[PDB]
Design a protein around this ligand. Structure first.
Ligand SMILES: Nc1ncnc2c1ncn2[C@@H]1O[C@H](COP(=O)(O)OP(=O)(O)OP(=O)(O)O)[C@@H](O)[C@H]1O
Ligand SMILES: Nc1ncnc2c1ncn2[C@@H]1O[C@H](COP(=O)(O)OP(=O)(O)OP(=O)(O)O)[C@@H](O)[C@H]1O
Lengths: 412, 305, 400, 206
């Protein structure tokens, strides 16, 4: 796909320029205080999302962004006859240019339905395919922000939170797209439902095909033990919480054999059907179990797991305590919630995006900081992760991916 | 606990732009801070301690030297960090006479060794010990006790080194700390003779083995040079041994005027905290640098940073 | 003075117990996640401020607070007639029991608080206040800029994180700038009064030198050059001219009275320089502490008074252009300053948005200002607590 | 103003102008007459500026007098005594009010035992220059307070500063010695105050 590769800044706040070269897998960005780490992340998040109307609220001269596939976006701020203008020029020659006062008027109309400028921006970014890759933006103020959101948000619906955060931290701030734990829970429920429905379709297909193969092939001590082990393992799984009578069927079949060639084929296709159902159960629940194993490697006195009951039909997703109690995901602390969101963003279940995390060491103990990046990279999503951190316990073991930022101050 | 690992600390070295120094303990940090602030009171060197770095290995957990060697080996070539360790008895020969195979400060890519056994061996100049004991004294019979102590200190270094060598031969380094008491010491004409007291809290096997090692090592230490002898004395052992030696000389020379007052002052000196003595010696040692040519310090280390 | 020395917690949130013993100068609390660091800071801040009406919103059994001077306060949450009552018992034997529901009603309206403050003012429980730095300083500062600020921000934060949260009273950077301007005006007026004093004093001093019986000119030259090149001087800065006139009249014309007048003039110049330095002592100490951290800029004044940041090109910028970490550095250095309010400084997560080179020096530069206050911090970073491991406190609560 | 005080300046009058144009149509101009709080802040700023100029002039006068005095009777002492008594008993010299003691020390120094007369006349000239610069600095404020206090009967607008608090307090002063803020004035007194400040030199040219 497309990953960012180079950001070229010119006279941010009329005093410094910057040029950062990235990796396609992991970029651990560190620097001094006030170096421009949060500003760099804001620039990248605005460029990748295609929210070019943010750039009327930044004082600059020229911003060039190079991706991995070669597409270059050049944003230039000019001042013609005391009137300031933003001109966005791509690498294929396609370009747009608008006035800063026009952009401020569009933002004011948003404060009250697309404008002409918003429609033109959307047309320009849609016809040029500027929105191939999303950008999940994790701000530094997310801990108080979700408490504010939980007192009155999703990736697609974050208008109020983006408006409040842009009011507090200036209008250059990108939209707050990082997933809430409610969004994580809903996505988990949908993935469980999709896996169950695929399992049901597989049950129907395997039942019909197995009946055909049995009836066609109709016209051993180790096999019974192997089928016994497979039926015991099938009965002892959480995924079989709607029907768990495999050992009884195995005992009935064994008693049918024991009371008195072609039956050997039925035995081996029974073993093969059990193996195929068990493997399709693992395949359909692969991402969920991998993600929950990544999360439960951090939590101490509880573990996240799912449960199915035959009376209800709502699959319960939440925290499980060693005493058997069940609690939803909102009873987590702040650090556990941060782990949950930052691990869902690096999961395969999340959307294709560029994961921008600002200060990942917020509200995390030193034991969790040493393992966060390892557990994010162990899911093998293939993302490009850009983190702006101050913690050496986060960045340990990844000194090949560390990027130092040193902006150049220009005198006048 | 709330502390960095080896790898996290190495990453911190990559991130930080300060000039850093890594020593084993906090006492070394305090002493080196006084040393640095004497030459440059506005210096910005930050001193870390390997004692406050967690190690996953159980053996490396409490082996400060192994932590420093491991860290220095893994970042060999960095510019902003220097290392200091304690030489201990390394590069010393015990072939019937004490011989120093280095006779200078070790240097290997910002890794340095103390000239003596440890950092506290810089305090073993007689003038520093005098000044420090004079400043920190009961102030009853200080002048005569200091004069007697100044007489004893020349030959006492052989006794102290013999005690340290006897401790390291049986690997019971902390044994003379609780075994030998100031009352066992006798003040002679510049020398001392720790009589084997019949009554001891420790078992007789350890006491007998200790005196066997002491007797077998004492003529070898006697034949050695005095200057070489003052550097092989264990840093922690020597401080306590001097505290007892001063308690003994104070009671020996002050009992005639008042036995009870001398005993109270001697016990008071013996009850002085080790930290108080080391800090007073450190301040005196800092003050004597640049005044006397016989006072040493890791000049190469300061020059390097 | 009076410093917190012991806090005991029994069945707080009906969940755990914890007894912590403190030092009187610096305490570095650390622990695992959910260990109750923030709850401990809230309990300490509510006890020290005397805001006992917060304790109606906390589920607990008994909270004991011991100060340094021996004053002991025991707070209990009793249950009588299916109603919860908060009982505060001093070491003097005086006590007050009040209902939880009345406190909740007074909170929803915003009488009982008047009785509470009468009890507090009677027993001097507000002898020393507490400055509370929360873990959400940055977004709260961003919210409030878009004691009245203390009241409104306290209300908004108690709206979000519950009503047990103490009153936010750390110095905001706008308050810091305003108080810096006020200190500059006071120093200017003190300099004016000092000039009027030394004016009338030096008249009779020269009058005294009427009948009393080289390098002095160089020293007067140095003093006039230093005073003329001083930023604290903005007006009547022509001492070089009158020095040149004086040396010209000397070279044109020797009396001992001339040398005595030179002595009087030199003493007046150096004394005005000494008062000019001593008037701006606190402001220069605070800005010297701040400018030891900032790398490519410098907070400075230059007089209407202007307080801002000098850049190496000479350009000026307001304090609002600073980053998050630099603003937090400003607030935490102002709280430990002598010009800051005398309180117990409680900081929750001081390592937020700070580079490690600043985290290593934060506690050193706060304690080196000789404020004498007690600082209690809860941190996750070992670089905050390095060099001060004697004051580290590890809390391991007993979960029930 | 009663509507405003139950809920403004020359430059910040948006709510008042909105209310006035709501009540009387949008042809009505902006409410530019000042508030008494604006008058109080302007008075404090003018007092501070006068003090700063007084300090600068004192430094310059000290420099000039020391230049004049080197490399060089009874009636001079009487005039200096009268000047010291006037400056000691002046409200503006609350920051330093020890001139008569200075005069007595000078008189005792002379009295215990030409060239001294030159020092005497330059000291008298320095005191006269300080007294005139005080009147020069406070001319607009004294003229405004003389215009205002010509109407007030049982109170007078006055200024008071301290070395305890460095904030000069301006407000109503009673003959019994009480101090009150300017908000305790009635409607007519406030109207007179605003109309005299609008015609004063302290206000902006309009
Ligand atoms: N509106 C502005 N006008 C001028 N300079 C500004 C403005 N906003 C920010 N700056 C400056 O530009 C830089 C912005 O850096 P940025 O906000 O990314 O810092 P940061 O990475 O969050 O820093 P820290 O590590 O201190 O948290 C800082 O030097 C800041 O002082
Ligand atoms: N109603 C409640 N309010 C606050 N905390 C509660 C409540 N009920 C239970 N707790 C628990 O009390 C503990 C104290 O939480 P707190 O935020 O103070 O933790 P901490 O030790 O300061 O650490 P951290 O800052 O990492 O959260 C947590 O484990 C929390 O789950």
């Amino acid at each position: 796909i497309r990953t960012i590769s180079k950001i070229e800044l010119s006279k941010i706040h009329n005093r410094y320029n910057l040029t950062v070269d990235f990796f396609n897998d992991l970029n651990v960005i560190h620097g001094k205080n006030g170096a421009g780490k949060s500003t760099l992340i804001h620039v990248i998040a605005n460029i990748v999302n295609g929210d070019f109307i943010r750039f009327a609220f930044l004082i600059f001269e020229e911003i060039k962004a190079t991706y991995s596939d070669g597409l270059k976006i050049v944003i230039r701020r000019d001042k013609i006859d005391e009137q300031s203008f933003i001109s966005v020029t791509l690498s294929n020659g396609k370009y747009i240019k608008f006035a800063v006062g026009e952009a401020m008027a569009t933002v004011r109309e948003i404060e009250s339905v697309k404008s002409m400028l918003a429609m033109d921006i959307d047309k320009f970014v849609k016809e040029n395919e500027l929105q191939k890759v999303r950008a999940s933006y994790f701000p530094a103020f997310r801990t108080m922000l979700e408490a504010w959101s939980s007192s009155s948000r999703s990736s697609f619906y974050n208008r109020k939170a983006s408006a409040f955060a842009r009011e507090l931290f200036g209008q250059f701030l990108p939209s707050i797209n990082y997933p809430s734990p409610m969004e994580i829970e809903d996505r988990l429920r949908e993935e469980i439902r999709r896996a169950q429905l695929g399992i049901a379709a597989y049950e129907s297909r395997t039942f019909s095909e197995s009946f055909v193969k049995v009836f066609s092939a109709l016209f051993t001590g180790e096999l019974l033990k192997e089928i016994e082990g497979l039926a015991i393992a099938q009965d002892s799984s959480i995924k079989n919480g709607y029907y768990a009578e495999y050992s009884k069927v195995y005992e009935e079949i064994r008693s049918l054999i024991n009371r008195n060639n072609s039956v050997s084929g039925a035995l081996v296709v029974y073993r093969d059907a059990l193996r195929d159902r068990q493997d399709y159960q693992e395949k359909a629940f692969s991402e969920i179990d991998n993600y929950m194993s990544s999360v439960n490697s951090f939590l101490e006195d509880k573990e996240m797991a799912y449960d199915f009951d035959l009376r209800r039909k709502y699959p319960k997703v939440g925290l499980k305590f060693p005493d058997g109690s069940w609690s939803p995901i909102r009873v987590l602390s702040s650090g556990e919630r941060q782990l949950l969101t930052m691990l869902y963003a690096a999961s395969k279940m999340g959307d294709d995006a560029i994961v921008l995390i600002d200060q990942p060491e917020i509200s995390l103990h030193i034991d969790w900081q040493e393992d966060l990046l390892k557990r994010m990279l162990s899911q093998l999503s293939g993302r490009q992760i850009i983190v702006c951190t101050h913690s050496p316990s986060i960045a340990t073991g990844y000194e090949d991916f560390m990027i130092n930022i040193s902006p150049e101050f220009i005198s006048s | 606990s709330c502390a960095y690992t080896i790898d996290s600390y190495i990453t911190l070295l990559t991130m930080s732009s300060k000039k850093r120094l890594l020593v084993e303990g906090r006492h070394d940090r305090s002493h080196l801070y006084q040393l640095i602030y004497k030459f440059n009171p506005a210096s910005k060197v930050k001193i870390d301690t390997a004692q406050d770095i967690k190690a996953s290995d159980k053996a490396m957990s409490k082996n400060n030297r192994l932590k420093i060697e491991t860290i220095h080996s893994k970042v060999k070539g960095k510019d902003n960090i220097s290392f200091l360790c304690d030489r201990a008895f390394r590069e010393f020969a015990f072939n019937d006479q004490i011989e120093d195979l280095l006779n200078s400060h070790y240097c290997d890519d910002s890794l340095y060794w103390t000239l003596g056994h440890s950092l506290e061996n810089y305090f073993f100049n007689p003038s520093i010990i005098i000044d420090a004991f004079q400043f920190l004294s009961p102030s009853e019979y200080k002048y005569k006790a200091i004069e007697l102590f100044s007489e004893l200190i020349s030959s006492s270094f052989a006794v102290l080194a013999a005690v340290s060598l006897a401790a390291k031969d049986i690997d019971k380094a902390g044994l003379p700390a609780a075994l030998i008491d100031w009352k066992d010491i006798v003040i002679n004409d510049g020398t001392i003779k720790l009589i084997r007291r019949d009554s001891y809290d420790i078992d007789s096997a350890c006491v007998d083995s200790f005196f066997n090692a002491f007797d077998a090592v004492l003529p070898r230490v006697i034949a050695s040079d005095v200057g070489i002898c003052s550097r092989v004395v264990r840093g922690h052992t020597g401080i306590l041994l001097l505290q007892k030696l001063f308690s003994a000389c104070l009671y020996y020379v002050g009992r005639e005027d008042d036995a009870l007052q001398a005993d109270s002052s001697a016990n008071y000196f013996c009850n002085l905290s080790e930290l108080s003595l080391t800090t007073a010696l450190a301040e005196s040692w800092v003050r004597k640098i640049g005044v006397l040519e016989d006072v040493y310090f890791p000049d190469s280390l300061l020059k390097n940073i």
